[PDB]
Coordinates of C-alpha atoms in Angstrom, one line a residue:
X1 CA -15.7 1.6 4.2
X2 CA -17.0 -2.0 3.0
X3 CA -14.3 -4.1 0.9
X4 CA -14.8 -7.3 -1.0
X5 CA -14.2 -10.5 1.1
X6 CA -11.8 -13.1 -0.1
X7 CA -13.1 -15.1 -3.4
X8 CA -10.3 -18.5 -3.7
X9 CA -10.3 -19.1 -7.4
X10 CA -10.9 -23.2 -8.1
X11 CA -9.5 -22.7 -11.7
X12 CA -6.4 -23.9 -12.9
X13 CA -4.0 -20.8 -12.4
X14 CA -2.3 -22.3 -15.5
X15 CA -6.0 -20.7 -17.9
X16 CA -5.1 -17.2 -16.3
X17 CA -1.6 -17.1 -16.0
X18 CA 1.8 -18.9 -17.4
X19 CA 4.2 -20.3 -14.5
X20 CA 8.2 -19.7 -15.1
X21 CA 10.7 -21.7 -13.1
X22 CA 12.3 -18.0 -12.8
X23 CA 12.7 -18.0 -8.8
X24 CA 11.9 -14.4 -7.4
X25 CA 12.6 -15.2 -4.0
X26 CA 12.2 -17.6 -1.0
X27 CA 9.4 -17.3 1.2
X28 CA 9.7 -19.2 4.8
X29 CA 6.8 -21.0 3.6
X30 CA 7.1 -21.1 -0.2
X31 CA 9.0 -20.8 -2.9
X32 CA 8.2 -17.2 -4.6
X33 CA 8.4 -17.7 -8.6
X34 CA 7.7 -15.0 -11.5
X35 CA 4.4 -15.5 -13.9
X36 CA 3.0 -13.7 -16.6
X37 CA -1.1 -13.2 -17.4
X38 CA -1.5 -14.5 -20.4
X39 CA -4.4 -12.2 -21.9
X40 CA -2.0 -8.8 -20.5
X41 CA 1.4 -10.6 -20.7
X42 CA 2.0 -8.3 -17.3
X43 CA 4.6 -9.7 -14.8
X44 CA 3.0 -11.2 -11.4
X45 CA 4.6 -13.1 -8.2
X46 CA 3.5 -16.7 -7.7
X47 CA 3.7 -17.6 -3.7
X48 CA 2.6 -21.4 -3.7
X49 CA 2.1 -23.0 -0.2
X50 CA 0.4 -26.3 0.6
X51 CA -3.2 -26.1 2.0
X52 CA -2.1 -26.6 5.5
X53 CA -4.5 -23.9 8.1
X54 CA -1.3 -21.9 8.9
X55 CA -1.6 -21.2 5.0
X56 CA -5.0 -20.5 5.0
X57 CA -4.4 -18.2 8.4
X58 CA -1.1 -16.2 6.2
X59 CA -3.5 -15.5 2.7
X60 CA -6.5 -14.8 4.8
X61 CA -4.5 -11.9 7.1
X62 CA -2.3 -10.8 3.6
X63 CA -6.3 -10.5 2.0
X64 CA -7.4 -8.1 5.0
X65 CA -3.6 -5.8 5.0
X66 CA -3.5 -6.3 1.0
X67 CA -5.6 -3.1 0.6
X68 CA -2.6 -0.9 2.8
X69 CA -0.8 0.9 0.2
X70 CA 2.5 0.5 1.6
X71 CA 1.4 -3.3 1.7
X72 CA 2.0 -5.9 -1.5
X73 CA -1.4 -6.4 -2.7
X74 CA -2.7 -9.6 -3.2
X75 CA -4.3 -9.8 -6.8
X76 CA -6.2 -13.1 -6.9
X77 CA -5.8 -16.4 -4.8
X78 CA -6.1 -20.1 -6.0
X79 CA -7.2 -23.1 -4.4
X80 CA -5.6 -25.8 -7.0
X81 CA -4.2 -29.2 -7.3
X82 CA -0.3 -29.8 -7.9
X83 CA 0.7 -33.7 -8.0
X84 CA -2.8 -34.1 -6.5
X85 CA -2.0 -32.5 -3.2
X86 CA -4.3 -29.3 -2.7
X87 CA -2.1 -25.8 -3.0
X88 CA -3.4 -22.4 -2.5
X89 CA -1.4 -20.2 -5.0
X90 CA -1.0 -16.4 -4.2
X91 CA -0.8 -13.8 -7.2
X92 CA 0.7 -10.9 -5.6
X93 CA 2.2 -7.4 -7.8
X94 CA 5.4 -7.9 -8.8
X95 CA 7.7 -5.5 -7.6
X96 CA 10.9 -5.7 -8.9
X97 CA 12.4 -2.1 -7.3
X98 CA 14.3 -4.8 -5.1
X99 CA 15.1 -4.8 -1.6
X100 CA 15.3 -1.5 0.2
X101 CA 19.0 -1.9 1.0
X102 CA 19.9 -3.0 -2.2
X103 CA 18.6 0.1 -3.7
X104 CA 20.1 2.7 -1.5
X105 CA 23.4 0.5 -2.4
X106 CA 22.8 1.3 -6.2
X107 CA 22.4 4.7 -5.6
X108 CA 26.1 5.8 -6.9
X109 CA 28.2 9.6 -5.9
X110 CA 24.6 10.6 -4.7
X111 CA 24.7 10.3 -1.0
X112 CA 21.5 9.1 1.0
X113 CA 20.1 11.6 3.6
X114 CA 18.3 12.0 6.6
X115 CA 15.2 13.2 5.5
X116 CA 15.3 10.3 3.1
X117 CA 15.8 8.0 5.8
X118 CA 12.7 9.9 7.9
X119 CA 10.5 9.3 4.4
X120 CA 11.7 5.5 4.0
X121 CA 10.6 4.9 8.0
X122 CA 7.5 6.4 7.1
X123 CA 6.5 4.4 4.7
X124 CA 7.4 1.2 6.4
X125 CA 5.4 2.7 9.3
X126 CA 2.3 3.2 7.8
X127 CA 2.0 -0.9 6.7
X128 CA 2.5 -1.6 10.5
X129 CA -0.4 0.8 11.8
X130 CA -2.5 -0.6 9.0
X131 CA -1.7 -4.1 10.8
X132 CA -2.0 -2.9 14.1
X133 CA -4.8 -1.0 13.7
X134 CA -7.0 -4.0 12.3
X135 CA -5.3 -6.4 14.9
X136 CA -2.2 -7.9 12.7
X137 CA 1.4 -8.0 13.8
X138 CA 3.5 -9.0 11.0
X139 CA 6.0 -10.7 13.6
X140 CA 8.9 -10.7 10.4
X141 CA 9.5 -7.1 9.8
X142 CA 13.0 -7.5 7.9
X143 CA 15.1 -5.5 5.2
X144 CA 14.3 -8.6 3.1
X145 CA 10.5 -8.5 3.3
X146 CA 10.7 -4.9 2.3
X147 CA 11.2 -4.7 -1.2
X148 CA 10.0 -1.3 -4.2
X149 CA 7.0 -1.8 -6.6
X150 CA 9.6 -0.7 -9.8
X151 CA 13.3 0.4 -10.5
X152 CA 11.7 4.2 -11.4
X153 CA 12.4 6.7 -8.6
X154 CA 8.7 7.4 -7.2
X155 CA 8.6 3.6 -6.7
X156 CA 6.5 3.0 -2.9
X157 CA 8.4 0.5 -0.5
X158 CA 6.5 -2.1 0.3
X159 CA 6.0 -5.0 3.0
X160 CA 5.9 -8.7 1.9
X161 CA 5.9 -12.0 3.6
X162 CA 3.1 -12.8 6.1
X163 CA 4.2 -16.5 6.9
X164 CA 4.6 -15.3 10.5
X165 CA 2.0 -12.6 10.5
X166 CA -0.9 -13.4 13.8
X167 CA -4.3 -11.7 14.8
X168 CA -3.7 -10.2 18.2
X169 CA -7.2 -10.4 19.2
X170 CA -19.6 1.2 28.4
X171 CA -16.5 3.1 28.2
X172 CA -13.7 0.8 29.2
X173 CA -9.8 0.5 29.4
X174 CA -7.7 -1.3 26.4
X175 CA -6.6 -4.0 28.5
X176 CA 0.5 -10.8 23.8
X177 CA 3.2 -8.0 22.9
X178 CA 3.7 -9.4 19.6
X179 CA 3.2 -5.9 18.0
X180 CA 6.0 -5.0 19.6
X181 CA 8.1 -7.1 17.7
X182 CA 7.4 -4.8 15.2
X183 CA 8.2 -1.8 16.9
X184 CA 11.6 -3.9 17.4
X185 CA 12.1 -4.6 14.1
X186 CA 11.6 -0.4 13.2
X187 CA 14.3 0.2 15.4
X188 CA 16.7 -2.2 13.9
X189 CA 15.8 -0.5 10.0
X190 CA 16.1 2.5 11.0
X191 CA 19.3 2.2 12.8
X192 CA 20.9 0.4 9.4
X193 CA 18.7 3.1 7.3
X194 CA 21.0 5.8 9.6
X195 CA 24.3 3.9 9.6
X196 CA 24.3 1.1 7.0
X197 CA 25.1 -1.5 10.1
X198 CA 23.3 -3.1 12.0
X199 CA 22.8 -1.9 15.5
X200 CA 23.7 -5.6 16.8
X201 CA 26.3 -7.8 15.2
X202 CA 28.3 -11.3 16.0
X203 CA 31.6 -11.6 16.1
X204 CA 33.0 -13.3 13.5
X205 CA 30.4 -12.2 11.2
X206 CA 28.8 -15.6 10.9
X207 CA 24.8 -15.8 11.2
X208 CA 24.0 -15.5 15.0
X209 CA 26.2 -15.4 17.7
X210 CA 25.6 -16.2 21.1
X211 CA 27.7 -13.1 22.3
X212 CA 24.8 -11.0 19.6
X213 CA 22.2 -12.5 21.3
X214 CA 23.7 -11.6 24.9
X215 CA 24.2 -7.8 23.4
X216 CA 20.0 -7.9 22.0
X217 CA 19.1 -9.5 25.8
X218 CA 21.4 -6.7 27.5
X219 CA 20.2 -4.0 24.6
X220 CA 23.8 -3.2 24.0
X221 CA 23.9 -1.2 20.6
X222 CA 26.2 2.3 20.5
X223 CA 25.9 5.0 18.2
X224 CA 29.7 5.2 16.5
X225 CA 31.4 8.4 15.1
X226 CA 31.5 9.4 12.2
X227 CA 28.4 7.6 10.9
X228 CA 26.6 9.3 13.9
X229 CA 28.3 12.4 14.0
X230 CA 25.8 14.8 12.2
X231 CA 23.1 12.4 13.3
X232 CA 20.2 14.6 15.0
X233 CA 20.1 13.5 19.3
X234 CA 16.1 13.6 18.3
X235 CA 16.5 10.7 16.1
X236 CA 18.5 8.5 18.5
X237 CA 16.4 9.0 21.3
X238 CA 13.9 7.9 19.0
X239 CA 16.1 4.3 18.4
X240 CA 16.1 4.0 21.7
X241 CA 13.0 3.9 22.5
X242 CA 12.3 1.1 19.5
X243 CA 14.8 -1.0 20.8
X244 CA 13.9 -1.0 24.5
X245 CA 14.9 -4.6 25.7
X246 CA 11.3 -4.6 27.5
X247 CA 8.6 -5.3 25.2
X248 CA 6.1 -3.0 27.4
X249 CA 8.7 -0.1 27.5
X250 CA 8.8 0.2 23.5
X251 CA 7.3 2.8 21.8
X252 CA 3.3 2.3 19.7
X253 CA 2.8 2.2 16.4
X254 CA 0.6 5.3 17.2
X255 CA 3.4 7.3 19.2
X256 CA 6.5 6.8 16.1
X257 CA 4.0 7.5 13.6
X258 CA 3.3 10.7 15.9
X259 CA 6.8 11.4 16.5
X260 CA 7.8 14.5 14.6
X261 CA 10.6 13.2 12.7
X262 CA 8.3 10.7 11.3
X263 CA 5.6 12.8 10.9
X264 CA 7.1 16.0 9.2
X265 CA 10.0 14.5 6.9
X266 CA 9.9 17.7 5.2
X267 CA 11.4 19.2 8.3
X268 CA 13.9 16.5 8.7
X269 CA 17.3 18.2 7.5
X270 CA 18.8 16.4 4.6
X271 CA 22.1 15.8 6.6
X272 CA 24.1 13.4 4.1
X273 CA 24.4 10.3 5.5
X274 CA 27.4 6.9 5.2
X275 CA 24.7 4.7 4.3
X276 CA 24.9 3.9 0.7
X277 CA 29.1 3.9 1.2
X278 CA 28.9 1.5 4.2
X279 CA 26.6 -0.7 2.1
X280 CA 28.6 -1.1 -0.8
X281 CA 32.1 -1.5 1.6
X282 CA 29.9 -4.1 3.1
X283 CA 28.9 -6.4 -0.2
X284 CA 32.8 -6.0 -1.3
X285 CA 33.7 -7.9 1.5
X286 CA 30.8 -9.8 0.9
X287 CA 32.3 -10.1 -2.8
X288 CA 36.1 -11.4 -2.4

C-alpha cells in the first residue's frame, strides 16, 4: 500500500555504473545513452537532463508511475555535476525488445491478429489508468515511447518518456482534459495496430501537413477495405469513440479498459490481420 519515496543519489553515477557514448535513443529532453553497472555488468538506460524544475517535475511523476508494470521503471536517480552544471541522471531498465511497431514488422510469414492487437491495447491501457488513476496524463502517448523489456516473445510493452507528462490535480460530484489526450493517442495505436496506417496522414508524406491537421480538426479518418474487411464493427466503434474530435465526448480510461474487447482478449477472434505486411511495404519505401 506504502512505497518508498524518491531517494536522488549525490554520488558520482560514474562509482555505480560505466557511461558509453552508445546513443539508445532521443528523449525531447535528453539524450538516452546505454550504461552498464559495473559490480553486475547488467545493461541500463542513462536519461541525463539538466536540473531545470520541469526535470525535477518529469523524474518526480516517472518515480510515482515507475512502480506500473506496464511502465519503465526507474532504478535509481542522480543528482550530479557534468562540466559543473547540476544534472539529474535517470537509470531506467533497459529494454531492448524495441519499438512496438518495429517488432510486429520483424515478425516474418506469421501474420499479426486481432486478438493480438486487443492484448497489445491492453497493455498500453493499463500504464494510462495507472496514470490516471494517481492523477498523471502522460500527454506523449506515441508508437515511439512504447518500446518491449527484451527480444524474447513473453517480453511486456512498456511506456517511456515522461518529458511532457502533468499532474491533473460529504459525498460530492467529480467536478483540464489533458487525459484525454491519452485517450487520443489510444485511438491512433490502435487504428495503426489494426491497419498498419495511420488513421490520419499528409499528403505528400512529409511531417505534418496542414490539409492532416484540417482532417484531425474535422476527425476525418475512414476505415479502407481490405485492411478493414474482417475487422469486427465492435472494434471500430470503439476507434471512434477514442478519436472523438471533442475532448469531452472521448471515451475514459475506465470505460476502454471496461470495454469487452479490451477486457476479454481471449474472446477476441484471432482474425489475421495486414499489419505486419503494411509495415514492412511501408519501411521499403522508407528504404529506396
Amino acid at each position: 500500500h506504502v512505497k518508498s519515496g524518491l531517494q536522488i543519489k549525490k554520488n558520482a553515477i560514474i562509482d555505480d555504473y560505466k557511461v558509453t557514448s552508445q546513443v539508445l535513443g532521443l528523449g525531447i529532453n535528453g539524450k538516452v545513452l546505454q550504461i552498464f553497472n559495473k559490480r553486475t555488468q547488467e545493461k541500463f538506460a542513462l536519461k541525463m537532463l539538466q536540473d531545470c524544475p520541469k526535470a525535477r517535475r518529469e523524474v518526480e511523476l516517472h518515480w510515482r508511475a515507475s512502480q506500473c508494470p506496464h511502465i519503465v521503471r526507474i532504478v535509481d536517480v542522480y543528482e550530479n555535476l557534468y562540466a559543473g552544471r547540476k544534472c539529474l541522471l535517470i537509470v531506467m531498465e533497459c529494454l531492448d525488445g524495441g519499438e512496438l511497431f518495429s517488432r510486429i514488422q520483424d515478425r516474418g510469414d506469421q501474420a499479426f491478429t486481432e486478438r493480438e492487437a486487443s492484448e497489445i491495447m491492453k497493455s498500453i491501457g493499463e500504464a494510462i489508468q495507472y496514470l490516471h488513476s494517481i492523477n498523471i496524463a502522460h500527454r506523449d502517448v506515441k508508437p515511439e515511447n512504447l518500446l518491449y523489456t527484451s527480444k524474447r516473445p513473453n517480453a511486456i510493452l512498456k511506456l517511456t518518456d515522461f518529458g511532457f507528462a502533468k499532474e491533473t490535480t460529504y459525498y460530492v460530484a467529480p467536478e483540464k482534459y489533458d487525459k484525454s489526450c491519452d485517450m487520443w493517442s489510444l485511438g491512433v495505436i490502435m487504428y495503426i495496430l489494426l491497419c498498419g496506417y495511420p488513421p490520419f496522414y499528409s499528403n505528400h508524406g512529409l511531417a505534418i501537413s496542414p490539409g492532416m491537421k484540417t482532417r484531425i480538426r474535422m476527425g476525418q479518418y475512414e476505415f479502407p477495405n481490405p485492411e478493414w474487411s474482417e475487422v469486427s464493427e465492435e472494434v471500430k466503434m470503439l476507434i471512434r469513440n477514442l478519436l472523438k474530435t471533442e475532448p469531452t465526448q472521448r471515451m475514459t480510461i475506465t470505460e476502454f479498459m471496461n470495454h469487452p474487447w479490451i477486457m476479454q482478449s481471449t474472446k477476441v477472434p484471432q482474425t489475421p490481420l495486414h499489419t505486419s505486411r503494411v509495415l514492412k511495404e511501408d519501411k521499403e519505401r522508407w528504404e529506396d
